[PDB]
């Protein structure tokens, strides 16, 4: 599963070391997810632009809110969050591609679903890790973030004419 | 001057090619500036944290507002903005360093002043270029951004016990 | 006409008996209409979901506002409103069907138009009855509700690419 | 216990089948609970009406908010919520009775307490099921709903001159 | 009926003379009704005071809003509204009594119901008169005022443990 | 009367043909009325300018709100509203004159009163027509618009030192 | 002086008897003052109407706020406020006259100044009495009311082209 | 009198020593009064709970606002406010009792009236002392606090079916 | 170019004569542009109506804001703005056509793009003229209006699936 | 550990007895924590006062919000919260000291950190106990309170120039 | 011209010396302009006072906003703003006169127009100077201030019955 | 004392002559105090600038609010307020000095404390004078202003690490 792979990678290399590692992974992934959403906001062309464009700002605001909470939780529990664009790009498991105007609306929606599916899996790894290490507060952070990501997947999938397929 | 160097670099490699190039430079530099401000927000320790920390969010919001306006102006005039973290990091003239908690408040304030001084110079290059190519709208964008950056320099310098020294 | 049929059914079995009967019919029909709108809100899939989904909440809020006003007017004039789900389902002239995700956006929009067309006809019966029995207040309630329903039909029809066809 | 009975009934007839079943039970029960609260809003007579009547709207709004969240969580995790008045009435474990103005304020308050006691027990079954099947998000939904129901029981019981007696 | 008596008295002594007369009667009666409501606000003692006292301000605000609309409609259609306390007291069909703290809550509620029952009957006379003289605007004013008065009667009656009994 | 003339002209050349015609007349007349009010807003000179100038914006906003409601009601009932400046100018019964700064405040106020007197008469024709054709919704629209116009006449007349003289 | 006359009349016929008497005088006078202001609001014609008319509502709201505070202070200290229109009219030292549209703007402004001059003198009597009887709270009420009345006199006098002349 | 006793106790053991002492007494008494009000908020059972419970929060907020103003005035004039729970409990003249759910609504209302009667007497002592020592600012603080306490007594007494009986 | 043609026409027939002429051209063109946008608002049918319809109101509000600013700037600098519908229609370079419901969504979007492209060119002529005549204030007005028009073109073009193509 | 000691003390002397005990401990400790924060608010002197002083009100509001939620949860689950200042002082594990102005800013910040460190440990005991006794709702209350306390420790520590050191 | 005289005086006695000088002139002139406007606010008597008096506060707020922006721009670019009342009075080119109540409304309006005409000319000098020295930001500040002053002149002139006559 | 000196100077050269004189002294002193506060706002450099700078705007707004109330009270009671910068500077007992950036934060805070200490003493003279002449309204104005000034002294002193030392 994607979950097993993320776990293995996050824990590859203190009593809360795994929790700190998975939070830092989320710092990098949220920053890249926000960049991807912003690319859709700017590069999209096609019918529906006038409601999809501002929808991207809602998603962006929510991702950046997650980023701030995740990073500060990591600081709070004694860690050190990534805080440069090079660190985000290098350590994120999400890939970016050069923006192009010729991407279709359908392609943008598919990419957004892939991003939130990835984030949902990362958060599940966060749940498993925080349960293991007994960090109830960080467990709750990951639960709320997963729930929000799953709701986003349902809605974006519905726009594509599909079910959530979690 | 820094201005001459930025101009040479921006115009190194259509009727509005230089304007598009300087806007795209600002896309990269604003994204890196925002990342640097966020690092201060997270890593700062020392007396004054409780007002400087939220001040960093004000600065961040303003930089991200500039980013959206600059990128969309570039799209509008027929360009293609950078839209990946790797593109921002590679093409920005601002350098980032790994976050460390041992940086002093004075060091953070000095770095912020350097960032806004750089941005002010970039915007002057934007003014010169848009005057050259006859783009009144983009000229006004750069004017407002420069004015805001200069005000920020005055205030941050005052916190350091210094004059603006533009 | 649908109007003649509704009238006959409402008045089938005091000085304001017909008015009380048509108000109670509206209690049942509004409750079922709200349930139908909610089904669209939940089950819809297809392009346009991201603006149609919240539009369903606007419609729902408006129907529930009508329900409260209609029921309380019925209480006020000496009647007794339906107030169980079984009473609503039994006495409403609107039918419901099990939700399915395979209904198209076009099918949902068509069903919504049928619902508001029905409601508009019921309200006309309300107008005729309240004119007959001299209830100016309840006449005004039905007028406003009809006007709102007719506007809704114009807008939903326009989304379908059609004229209002009242 | 009521909890054991609800569990047996919900699970009577995929990795999250029990969770989907208990969510769908809540869809039906919340819809019936809302109808019961609305009946109190409309039919109540007696001293205290002027503050109890609007209190019923607060309760109604909260139940309908729960309904929307519960139904959409069920959709999100791959289920299909009840979405007709007949389905709600048939599958709910709550009974309704024809409205009558001769019910006392004390009788209405007692019925409301019974409704929230039932809901609290259903949510406990939801907790047990979601723990069993490892659904942290739906577990949190049921926890918050139970906590809110228990608070409501304390306050309504206090109005009756009684302790919460959970 | 009270309606027949009010009509006879209003029309006792131009194309809109009866409409002007019934509006002026409402000017006097609304001013006296407001004074009566204010007396309840000030003199009430007994359980329920803490919600009934502010309820009286809601009623007062609504009566004074009616007064302003009624008076200005009378001016607008070429009349001359009563505008002294002596004119209000003399021409109103409502009687006032010296305030006393020994009136019970039940007595205050009964008096309020009598006031709104009277106003509802006056407004019916307004409806009949404006229909007779073809004044659609003033007819609508009286309709809305009657509807509001009837709703108030339902709610106040409910507080007394009674039905509306219009 | 002006009313008889408007009726004759509106009905000069389906079950709701007269209603559609009078609504379309109002589309043209409201658009011209708004233009006339705007001319006063811009060209006025004289004592009182500082409160009369913003008063013109209130009037303008109200006329444009009427225009939108009237046009959309016409669409809703199966008609086709005028929607070009040439159609408004040609079909309106209101005349416009070239703006001049030498018009007095008194002259502007007199012209405004003439405009609202005309509109009030048009709305009366709307009332008669909608009564004839049984359109309760459009009847209510015209009633509210007439009532608002009559109130405006009272207030503007008062500013001139005169009675409403409807 | 007017002050000496008011004092003599108020105290003409317990440790706070004079304070209760002067508060009750203010209940009657404020109610009559409000009625007089309302008459100006309705009957005024002439240039300036469009700002003077709403100014009358500001004055009215302020007088009614004073009335509520004065009456409730009287209740609070063991008194019984006037609470009928006949009591207000009989015991007030302010006279009212039948409304007429032929009163000039200048006449209305002069009457308003007379009213507030009277109120200011009554409040001075309130100050003297509350100082005598040691009621600091009621002294403060009268001080604030006097200060507000004196400010109103300055502003209304200025509109008349005059100084305050207290 | 209670006033004489409070004075004797406050002044029992600089130019503003008595003023500082009475302010500090109010610090202790307000803190205990707030605790007593909170006990009612939590422990109350009986009809009326649903409006009395939130009323206790209004009272609590007002007492805590008084506490902050009183304490800071004491600091401002050169004193040192009590600032531990033991100091509040020891020096307050108000007694507390263990919470019990078996206290009636009537008992809670009676206790609240006793508390505000005590506070009103303390504030009178504050008035006498600040007059003696020439502290106009602190005199005004006590006046406003007394006036507010007396109003609270009127309203709470009215809920009990009684007059204020100050 | 369109720019050269507009310039020639505007200047065809004082130190700021050309500036006054181009402002007056904008008065006429903005009024016609607003009428065209309103026609789309009313006549549109097809998928997307439910978000495009309110989008037309945003565009309309922005055009009318431009109209007021442009007209008042013209007054301010000593000119006389067009202020009748006939003057707007005659002098505008934009043509209108009779509304028809059979226009497609694509056709409406294309017409809107043509309108804003025209306005953008007019504003460029405004820039050239105000630079020539040394009117910095009116130059800034045209710059902001052009920038806003260009942004609108980007967004509307994106909805059509196209680039801005300025 | 502090956690082991708190557990032993809380459980020293029904199915939810331990949960009730730890909630009641939090009632006492939150009340004392609020008193300590208030002492800092009042007694602080030194550079930074102007932002630290209002920061203390934010902390105070948050502690009092926790207090209300904790106490009402205890009532809800069948307990009886401490509700006198003597009970809070006696049963709290936090000590208070007489206020003195000679405490430094650094001393106040250190004391605040000790308070929140204590609260964080108490909440961990709450987590362990509620897990043991199966109270999911109270577990969530303690989780949120712990998370908030840990965030507060990070921020206050940062103001001191230190890391969180949980 | 006034412009030539201001220029000569400002530049009478670094790369931005003239810009700093003209900004400092504006600091002095804005402070004096605000004082003059305040004198009108206080000393005015005559019909129209009730709308002109608050209009003076709008003007005052706008002038003080200009003052803050101008002064801070001067600081920002390396200057030192006047910051005493004696410096403002001495260096301003505006004269003040002792307040007198016998000035007419017409006289006050004439003086206000003279003030804004002066300010408009100063801002033109600011435009010329900032163009000369290449300060785009300060050029924009002066442009906006001039545009606002010219609009104010149009409106105040209109109140006087005159054209703008710039 | 400073108080004795101010009194002697104010009364050095009608029944309220001394009150008018002390109010006019406050007009001059408040205007100079505002100028001094503004100088701090602009010229301050040093750690804490980012919270002290906006604090100066709060102080400025409060002083200007006092100025307006004081001046208008003086007008109201028959006086004539200073209303030129030269009158303020000449008659104020506060001295100003040329702004310099080399003033320390500590120096600015000390000057602010001196200003408010002076104002507090002036207000005491106002209290003595208004008591002497029997002006209760102006006495209350001075009381509130003194209380506010004393609070400001406590807070500013606390920022300096000192007690209020009134
Ligand atoms: Fe943050
Ligand atoms: Fe954007
Ligand atoms: Fe309701
Ligand atoms: Fe929903
Ligand atoms: Fe009115
Ligand atoms: Fe519309
Ligand atoms: Fe009241
Ligand atoms: Fe405080
Ligand atoms: Fe305008
Ligand atoms: Fe609570
Ligand atoms: Fe500033
Ligand atoms: Fe003022
Ligand atoms: Na009707
Ligand atoms: Na006093
Ligand atoms: Na959990
Ligand atoms: Na420019």
Query: Could you give phi then psi for residue A154, rounded to 5 degrees?
Result: -55, -50
Contact C80 D99 (CB under 8 A): yes
Q: Write out the residues of chain I at the interface with chain K, using a CB-CB cutoff of 8 A.
A: 72, 75-78, 136-137, 140-141
Tokens of D119: 């809901």
G interface residues, F as partner, C-beta within 8 Å: 44-51, 53, 101
What whole-number distance in Å separates Cα of residue K14 and Cα of residue D56?
74
Q: Identify the three-state secondary structure at position B105.
A: helix
Considering CB atoms only, which of C143, C154, C165 is closest to F136?
C143
Find the closest chain F residue to G53 by CA distance: F155
Give me the sign of the Cα torsion angle J51, J53, J54, J59.
positive
Euclidean distance between CA atoms J163 and A76, whole angstroms: 8
Alpha-carbon span L91 to L82, nearest angstrom: 9
Q: Is the CB of C51 less than 8 angstroms away from the CB of I46?
A: no
> In C, which residues are within 8 Å of F76 by CB distance?
150-151, 153-154, 164, 166
Among candidates H125, H18, H130, H137, which has minimal Cα distance to H72? H137
Q: Which of C104, C106, C152, C161 to probe by mutation at the I interface, max I CB count within 10 Å?
A: C161
State the Cα angle at G36 between G34 and G38, rounded to 5°: 70
Chain F residues with CB under 8 Å of a chain I CB are 31-32, 35, 38-39, 42-43, 71-72, 75, 80-89, 96-101
Check if the beta carbon of residue I108 is closer than 8 Å to that of residue I36: no
CB contact under 8 Å between H136 and L150, yes or no, is: no
Q: In the block, which residue shows the tokens 């009593």?
A: A15
Q: Are J27 and J84 within 8 A, CB to CB?
A: no
Q: How far apart are CA B31 and CA B68, in angstroms?
A: 10
With beta carbons less than 8 A apart as the criterion, state whether L45 and B162 touch: yes
Q: Could you give the angle at the alpha carbon of L92 between the alpha carbons of L90 and L95, nearest 5°?
A: 90
Residues L161 and L105 sit within 8 Å (Cβ to Cβ):
no
Tell me the chain K residues in contact with residue G51 when contact means C-beta distances shorter than 8 Å.
50-51
- What is the C-alpha to C-alpha distance for residues C165 and F14, in angstroms, rounded to an integer? 13
J140 CA: distance to closest CA in chain L (Å): 37
* Cβ atoms < 10 Å from Cβ of J34: 21
> Nearest 5 degrees, angle CA B156-CA B158-CA B163?
110
Q: Are G105 and G48 in contact (CB under 8 A)?
A: yes
Q: Which residue of H lies nearest to E105 if distances are taken between CA atoms?
A: H161
| Cβ-based neighbours of E59, under 8 Å, separated by 6 or more | E37, E112, E152
CB B72 within 8 A of CB B63: no
CA distances from F109 to C164, F30, F36, F152 (A): 41, 18, 11, 11
For F45, the 3-state DSSP assignment is: coil
Shortest CA gap G101–chain L (Å): 31
Residue for token pair 């969510």: D23
Cβ within 8 Å, pair J51-L52: no
The residue of B83, B87, B94 whose CB has the most chain A CBs within 10 angstroms, and thus the best one to mutate to test that interface, is: B83
Residues of G in contact with F162 (CB under 8 A): 45
For residue J11, what are its two tokens?
Answer: 């459980």
CA A112, chain centre distance (Å): 10
SS3 call for C100: coil
Which helix H or strand E contains I63, and what residues bound it? Answer: helix I49-76
Q: How far is the CA of K59 from the centre of ligand 5 (A)?
A: 30
Give the Cα separation of J57 and J37 in Å (integer).
8
Who's near H77: CB < 8 A, 6+ residues apart? Answer: H16, H19, H20, H23, H135, H138, L150, L164, L166
H to I contact (≥3 Cβ pairs closer than 8 Å): no
**Beta carbons of A65 and A125 less than 8 angstroms apart:** no
CA distance H115 to H110: 9
Touch of I by K (3+ CB pairs closer than 8 Å)? yes
CA angle, B51 as apex, B50 and B53 as ends, to 5°? 75
Q: How far is the CA of J38 from the centre of ligand 8 (A)?
A: 8
Rounded to whole angstroms, the Cα distance separating G6 from G110 reads: 21
Helix (H) or strand (E) segment spanning residue E48: none
Q: Could you give the CA distance from residue I146 to residue I163 in angstroms, rounded to a whole number?
A: 18
Alpha-carbon distance values, E85 to A33, I70, J143 (Å): 71, 53, 64
Give the position of tokens 């409806």. Answer: E127
| Closest of I115, I126, I119 to residue I10, by C-alpha | I126
Q: Where are the alpha helices (DSSP H) in chain B?
A: 2-10, 17-43, 49-76, 85-91, 105-133, 136-159
- Residue B83 DSSP SS3: coil
Our answer on whether A and F touch (3+ beta-carbon pairs < 8 Å) is no
- For residue K14, the chain B residues in CB contact (below 8 A) are none
Ligand 7 center to E47 CA (angstroms): 17
- Write phi, then psi, for D19 (nearest 5 degrees): -60, -45
How many angstroms does the Cα of residue G35 sit away from the middle of ligand 12?
28
Contact call for E76 and F165, based on CB within 8 A: no
**φ, ψ for residue E159, nearest 5 deg:** -60, -35
Q: Both tokens of residue G83?
A: 């609470």
Number of helices and strands in chain G (H, E): 6, 0
The structure tokens listed for J67 are: 């207090």
**Residue G21 · residue G133 · CB < 8 Å:** no
Write out the residues of chain C at the interface with chain D, using a CB-CB cutoff of 8 A: 31-32, 35, 38-39, 42-43, 71-72, 75, 80-89, 96-101
Buried b vs exposed e over D55-65: b needs ≥16 C-beta within 10 Å? bbeebbebbbe
- Tell me how many helices (H) and strands (E) chain K has: 6, 0
Q: How many angstroms separate the CA atoms of D42 and C72, rounded?
A: 7
DSSP state of K46: S
Chain F neighbors of C165, CB-CB under 8 A: 78
Q: D151 and J77 in contact by Cβ < 8 A?
A: no
3-state secondary structure chain D: CHHHHHHHHHCCCCCCHHHHHHHHHHHHHHHHHHHHHHHHHHHCCCCCHHHHHHHHHHHHHHHHHHHHHHHHHHHHCCCCCCCCHHHHHHHCCCCCCCCCCCCCHHHHHHHHHHHHHHHHHHHHHHHHHHHHHCCHHHHHHHHHHHHHHHHHHHHHHHHCCCCCCC
Q: Which ligand is nearest to the CA of C72?
A: 3
- Cβ pair G96, E84 in contact under 8 A: yes
Residues of J in contact with L161 (CB under 8 A): 45-47
* 3-class DSSP state of B45: coil
| CA dist., res. C45 & res. C49, Å (int) | 6
Tell if the CB–CB gap between L166 and H76 is shorter than 8 Å: yes
Domain positions in chain C = 1-166
Contact indicator for E85, G94 with CB cutoff of 8 Å = no
Question: Minimal Cα–Cα distance from I128 to chain B, Å?
Answer: 10
Q: How many CB atoms lie within 10 A of CB F14?
A: 10
Helices (H), chain H: 2-10, 17-43, 49-76, 85-91, 105-133, 136-159
* D99 contacts: CB under 8 Å, gap ≥ 6: C80, C81, C82, C83, C84, D39, D42, D43
Distance in angstroms (rounded) separating the CA atoms of residues J108 and J97: 12
Helix axes G105-133, G49-76, angle to 10 degrees: 20
| Nearest one of K127, K91, K147 to K19, comparing CA atoms | K127
Token pair belonging to A129: 């890790």
Q: Using an 8 Å CB-CB cutoff, list chain B residues near K76.
A: 150-151, 153-154, 164, 166
Cα J49 to Cα J46: distance, rounded to the nearest angstrom:
6
Contact D154 J75 (CB under 8 A): yes
Query: How far apart are the C-alpha atoms of L104 and L47, rounded to whole Å?
Result: 10
CA distances to L25, L32, L149 from L9, rounded to whole Å, are 10, 18, 21
Separation of alpha carbons A78 and K138, rounded Å: 47
d(CA C90, CA C88): 6
User: Which residues have CB atoms below 5 A from the ion given as ligand 10?
Assistant: J 68
Say yes or no for a CB contact (<8 Å) between F155 and G49. yes
CB J30 within 8 A of CB J70: yes
J10/J23 Cα distance (integer angstroms): 10
Cβ burial, residue F162 (10 Å; 0-12/13-18/19+): middle
The beta-carbon neighbor of B140 closest among I143, I154, I164 is I143
Closest CA to J164 of J148, J155, J108: J155
Give the three-state DSSP class for A11: coil
Angle between helix K105-133 and K2-10 (nearest 10): 60
| Rounded-to-integer distance, Cα G86 and Cα E85, Å | 7
Token pair recorded at residue F15: 């079950």
Q: Are C91 and C28 in contact (CB under 8 A)?
A: yes
CA F131, CA F125: separation in Å to the nearest integer?
10
> C-alpha I30: how far from its chain's center?
4
Q: Using a CB-CB distance cutoff of 8 angstroms, which residues of chain K are in contact with residue B147?
A: 137, 140-141
F71: CB partners within 8 A, 6+ apart: F23, F27, F81, F83, I42
Q: Based on the number of CB atoms within 10 Å of its own CB, is K62 exposed (0-12), middle (13-18) or buried (19 or more)? A: middle
The answer to whether the CB atoms of H49 and D162 lie below 8 A apart is: no
Counting beta carbons within 10 angstroms of the beta carbon of residue L100, is it exposed (0 to 12), middle (13 to 18) or buried (19 or more)?
exposed
- H contact set with L (CB within 8 A): 72, 75-78, 136-137, 140-141
Nearest to I42 among F75, F85, F89 (CB): F75
Query: F53 and K162: CB-CB below 8 Å?
Result: no
Protein residues near ligand 9, an ion, with CB under 5 A: I 68
Across L131-156, b (16+ Cβ under 10 Å) vs e yields eebebbbbbbbbbbbbbbbbbbbbbb
The residue assigned the tokens 């507010």 is: H148
Q: How far is the alpha carbon of E95 from chain G, nearest alpha carbon, in Å?
A: 9
Inter-CA distances, K135 with B6, B128, B137, J89, Å: 19, 12, 17, 66
Instruction: Give F83's contacts in chain I (Cβ within 8 Å).
Output: 35, 38-39, 42-43, 98-99
Residues J55 and J53: their CA atoms lie apart, in Å, by 5
Report residue I162 as tokens.
């196209």
> Quick check: E70 and G67 in contact, CB under 8 A?
no
Distance CA C22, CA K17 (A): 83
The sign one gets for the Cα dihedral F140, C28, C44, A112 is positive
Identify the contact set of chain I against chain B, taking CB-CB distances under 8 A.
127, 139-140, 143-144, 146-147, 150-151, 153-154, 163-166
Rounded Cα distance, E83 and E36, in Å = 18
CA torsion angle for D129, D133, D136, D140 (degrees, to 10)? Answer: -10
User: Of D95, L81, J137, H78, nearest to K35 (Cα)?
Assistant: L81
E120: left (phi over 0), alpha (psi -120 to 50) or beta: alpha
Nearest partner of E76 among J76, A148, F164, B105, judged by Cα: F164
Quickly count: other Cβ atoms within 10 Å of residue G9's Cβ: 13
Phi and psi dihedrals of J85, rounded to 5? -65, -35
DSSP-based helix, strand, coil % in chain A, nearest 5? 75, 0, 25
* Assigned token pair, D106: 């004390």
Closest ligand to C-alpha of residue E54 is: 7
* CB-based burial, I137-157: b 16+ in 10 Å, e otherwise: bbbbbbbbbbbbbbbbbbbbb
**CATH dotted code for K1-166:** 1.20.1260.10
Q: Which of B55, B106, B161 is the best substitution to test chain L (most L C-beta atoms within 10 A)?
A: B161
Q: Phi and psi (nearest 5°) for D30?
A: -65, -40
């Amino acid at each position: 599963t994607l979950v097993e792979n993320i776990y293995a990678s996050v824990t590859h290399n203190s009593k809360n070391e795994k929790t700190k590692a998975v939070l830092n992974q989320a710092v990098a992934d949220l920053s890249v997810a926000a960049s991807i959403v912003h690319q859709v906001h700017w590069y999209m062309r096609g019918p529906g632009f006038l409601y999809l464009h501002p929808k991207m700002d809602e998603l962006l605001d929510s991702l950046n809110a997650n980023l701030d909470e995740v990073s500060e939780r990591l600081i709070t529990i004694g860690g050190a969050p990534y805080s440069t664009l090079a660190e985000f790009s290098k350590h994120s498991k999400l890939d970016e591609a050069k923006g192009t105007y010729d991407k279709t609306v359908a392609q943008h929606l598919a990419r957004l679903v892939e991003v939130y599916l990835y984030l949902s899996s990362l958060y599940q790894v966060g749940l498993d890790i925080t349960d293991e290490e007994g960090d109830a507060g960080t467990n709750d952070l990951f639960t709320a973030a997963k729930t929000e990501a799953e709701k986003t997947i349902w809605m974006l999938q519905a726009e594509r004419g599909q079910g959530p397929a979690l």
